[PDB]
Ligand binder design. Sequence first.
Ligand SMILES: [K+]
Ligand SMILES: [K+]
Length: 263
Amino acid sequence: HPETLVKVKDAEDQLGARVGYIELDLNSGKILESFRPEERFPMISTFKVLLCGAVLSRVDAGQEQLGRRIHYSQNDLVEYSPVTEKHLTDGMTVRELCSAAITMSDNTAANLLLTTIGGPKELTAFLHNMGDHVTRLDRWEPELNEAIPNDERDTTTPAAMATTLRKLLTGELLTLASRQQLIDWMEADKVAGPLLRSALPAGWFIADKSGAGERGSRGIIAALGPDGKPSRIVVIYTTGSQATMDERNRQIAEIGASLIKHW
Ligand SMILES: [K+]
Ligand SMILES: [K+]
């Protein structure tokens, strides 16, 4: 609904930065509303859902086991690795790493998983192979969060990310076991606290992944809907703002409040 575009525009006024937005019908794939749908924005941590989608695809193809244990060392730890920093000696399984990466925003976990699939180049190849010719991952954590103005490395567009997430959560790319495992990881409630979840009415379903990077970069991807069943995909990104994290969060939430109101 255009009333939501009013809020997206208000957000740009408040943040002094670009905001990309898209609302997609989960069932049909029809774009319901958009703002800067084909402009690039850093994916930041939202790329982790795509990463684990590629991991699950390999599990489906028998090239990976969710129960496989991976050991690493202090040499592998990068900034913000809450789960991995405490399993240096125990190691972690592929399943535990995807859970840590998606639900706990663990960066080392994402790097370990990137290594298992062949790195940024293979994630990008995976994306292209499924029809996403826009999204690209070029670097590892933490450099992929640089958000350099006008840099296309590690970026997506609201439209590409929304369409790719729909394909991952519907259709045939993943087996039902994998689709649901991906959704379950996105449903866990740990990170996306003050964003779209804060605006969600009771009984509504939401599977999401938010991210924050350098230079004001922020983003969230989500599948949500009433009655514990998702029916739409929403993708919001912004980069370049000098506003506080709290200010950026409030704007994203206000956009969510509007989307819900005019559902
Ligand atoms: K290393
Ligand atoms: K989540």
